[PDB]
Design a protein around this nucleic acid. Sequence first.
RNA 1: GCCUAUAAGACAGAAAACUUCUUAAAGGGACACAUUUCAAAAGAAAAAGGAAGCAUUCAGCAAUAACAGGUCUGUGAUGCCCUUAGACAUCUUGGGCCGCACGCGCGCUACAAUGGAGUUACUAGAGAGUACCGAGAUUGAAAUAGUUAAGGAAAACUCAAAAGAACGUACAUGACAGGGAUAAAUGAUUGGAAUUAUUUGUUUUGAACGAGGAAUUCCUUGUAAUAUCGAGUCAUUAACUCGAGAUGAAUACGUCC
Lengths: 60, 141, 99, 144, 155, 72, 185
Amino acid sequence: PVIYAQVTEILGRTGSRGGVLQVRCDIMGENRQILRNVKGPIRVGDILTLLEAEREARRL
Amino acid sequence: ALKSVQVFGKKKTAIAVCLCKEGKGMIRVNGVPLDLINPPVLRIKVFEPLFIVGKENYAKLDLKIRVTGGGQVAQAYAIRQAIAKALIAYNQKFVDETTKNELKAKFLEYDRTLLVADPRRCEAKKFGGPGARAKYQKSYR
Amino acid sequence: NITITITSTKVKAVESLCAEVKENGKKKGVQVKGPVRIPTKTLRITTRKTPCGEGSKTWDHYQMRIYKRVLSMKTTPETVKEITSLKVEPGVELEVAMF
Amino acid sequence: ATVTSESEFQHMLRVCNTNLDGRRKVPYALTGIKGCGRRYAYLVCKRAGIDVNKRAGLMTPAEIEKIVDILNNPLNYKIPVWFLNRQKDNKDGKDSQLIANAVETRLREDIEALKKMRAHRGLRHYWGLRVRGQHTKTTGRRGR
Amino acid sequence: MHHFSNIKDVVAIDFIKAYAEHLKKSGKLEIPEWVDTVKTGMCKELAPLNPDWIYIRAAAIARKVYLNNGIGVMALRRAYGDQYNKHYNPSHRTLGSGKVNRYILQQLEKMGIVAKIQSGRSLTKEGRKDMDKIAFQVYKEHEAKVTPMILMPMN
Amino acid sequence: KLNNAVLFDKATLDKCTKEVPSMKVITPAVVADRMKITCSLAKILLKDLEKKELIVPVKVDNHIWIYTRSAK
Amino acid sequence: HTFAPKLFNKWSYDVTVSDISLKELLAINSKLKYQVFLPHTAGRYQIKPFRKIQCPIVERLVCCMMQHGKNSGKKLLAMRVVEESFEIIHLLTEKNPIQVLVDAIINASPREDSTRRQAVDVSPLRRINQALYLMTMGCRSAAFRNSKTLAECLADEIVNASKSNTASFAIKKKEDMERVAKSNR
RNA sequence: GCCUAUAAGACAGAAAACUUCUUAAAGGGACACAUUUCAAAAGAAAAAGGAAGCAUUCAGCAAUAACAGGUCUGUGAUGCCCUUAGACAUCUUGGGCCGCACGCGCGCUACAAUGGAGUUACUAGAGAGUACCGAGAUUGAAAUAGUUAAGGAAAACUCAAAAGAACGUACAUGACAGGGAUAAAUGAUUGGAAUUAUUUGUUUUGAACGAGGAAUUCCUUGUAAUAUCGAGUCAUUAACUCGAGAUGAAUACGUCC
């Protein structure tokens, strides 16, 4: 039901309180990149658990 | 006769002075056996230096530890340092080096604080607050 | 058996006096027991900085330090330290206590 | 773990014109008397020989009566004088015997006697203020 | 390993239980009339619940004379002391009731267990003899019941 | 509000003996809950069952009592 | 010659983790320092970022079991409570108590949260922290003013949250947050 | 010298070398040097080594200019004004500064079973002390406290931990044994004097309080938090402050909302 997205590299943060990072992640099953917003803490090697992959989280 | 070495371990304030000597495997802390340590839940923690390398490394060794500081849990960590160091120092003085290096390597790969003391100590209280960092409540209106 | 104890507020002063007694003890004296260093006494006083109660509650810390050294001789009761003064420096007190 | 006899367990026991919970043990149900507290209850049980671990609801009538007499005759039951509530009594007699519903009446009558005597402590009891000399500017602020 | 040399080699609470009943069977300890009407100190709010609280305390006081050379009554008062928390003020340490400690200490002198050091009290050769004789019995049962941690199976 | 038991009756004790040993985790807390008896009673009943050898102790201390079913 | 430390002389560390996203962030058996006789170590795991992942996972559960005013610094209490609860967990489910706790953490950790609102993912380290936070919080509330003991209230909390059971406080909280975030895309 | 062991020691009381611990002086020891990467440079981030690698941590001192910020009630520091023998000088006795319909601030104790109560073994650091100051030991006894009374101008004598821990078919979820206000009848301490309870013991009395609205405070590691010890004031009186150790969380390594 879920798919995993290994973190590639960290763009930065989101809304000025700075509690959410923007991380670019790639899915191993389809070698396809994606950009997601994550609730910290995170590191470069971490692998996420995504229940949705069509949401290109960009914050405009 | 009676080849012996002296070591010591430290915690916040606890100091565990040991005297590693040839014997039959008895370990005494302030005169009482290691199996009758007052905080009984911590006994297997104090005994873990024995099991990290095998009790046979202490079978021919008799210890006499004096602990005169700190609380009760701190003294448990001081004795852990004293027992682990006593084996290391003894094998350096009366045994060749490669045994000592192997023994200290086995201690290090499990827990570093077995042979090196923890440097953390209490911070001084500062005025305007009831502790080191906390401060009294501020009222405006 | 003779016992000497020197106390002062300056650490550098007693070390000079401890050395002097040991050096002086070659003649008119047989041996010079090493200076037993009694633990330092610290006299702390914490006081409010303000002559009134106004302002932030700020305190200031003062502390005196007392350095105590113990020397033991054999010598003779008549000879003792002889001069025993050597125009001793201000603030450094020497007393000689035999048995 | 034995099935108790149903006719033995009394949920209440009427001792000195007051009823006590039968579920509590003997000393802690004896605290239900207005004149007897915890320490007095433990001593009374020991003097009269009732087991301290038995439930009060299982007290036999013989034991219940043996509790009563010591309560209102404590001096002859080898109870120390300092253990008593009302020592050096007025109105003749020097026996306390305040383990009853008479503890408040003795308290009430003195205050009325103190009110008649018009002392400062008695006057403060009239006005309903703090009587033992405490600050009333900030505390004791029950709204009125 | 384990070897018996003195009372430090047995569990203190297990020894105190053993020394308590031995004084009971001996019967040389006299019970004061105020045994049930007192508490062990000012701090407490209830009298001791154990029926033989006198005998347990006597064993503990005897052990303290074994370990410490010369002990005064006041040192026992602070040893058996609680925290005074009867009001809104934060609790502070308080002494025990000196009468029960002095009485039991005096009683232990009657049975020829303790002595009169010029600055406290000590143990006697026969008092040491009985104390260690019971302690050795506690050591044997302890070893036959539990296994030593040194010989605890490797897991 | 619960006023569970205080002391035993024939009706509660018979079910106590028959079904308490048949559970997997037995402590004075649960058997008080299921059998509606005070936890002080649960200590008395569990001691008797241990003496009668229908429940085996896995952890008994001055802090908590845990027993369990015994089939051997 | 081959030292294999266990838990309190009863439980081993031969656990497997279903969630690969938490395999590296859980200190179970990858290193010898993670296998400890006691969940009591004085190591400094809060001096650098991502250092608490080096703490043994059972110890982390003990440290969170030390909450609110009059339970501050009573690690010996929380150690005893967890040790008693681990025996009950083994009795209830007849598995390795460590293994059940691994399954409880995986199944009682939200995978999606909302933040101003916008649905955002939950990082692997946050999932582990929130798992131990929700399980401990429910056990504390269940045992307050209750005849049951903390070890009893901790044991059933873990086993219920272990497989899927919604009676657990953690599972209720987890499904609540994910439902809110799902509507907050 | 005494006592128990299968076989080592324990304790008492001597008495001599010894210096790992302890004490305290002199030196030594980290400066990011050195590797990897990033930015020709200043530099930055791992990791290893190390007792120590955020400037190593916590503090002290801390520039220019300013407020008409507080104190003339600390000063025989002080200008001007006021009172100045029926005094706003000074002394004596009594009271008040504690007075309660209420409102606000700093705190202590609780609302319990991660608990209260009964017993048992415990384990620190930094303090302070005489021409009556800190008080050992012995006794009187239920407790406060009383009568006799060593050593100590002190690493020498006094001075001592409790949170926590261990024992039981104790308490079992109920304002109950959680809570200890309010009142009562009595025992003593300090004082020339204790009533408007100085402080405290005994027995009884058993109130709100079921985790707290709008709001708001402090805190990043031996830190918060929890409970205690010492000192300042102190004839007597800490819930206050200044320090000290005891156990040892969680949560970030961020961004200017």
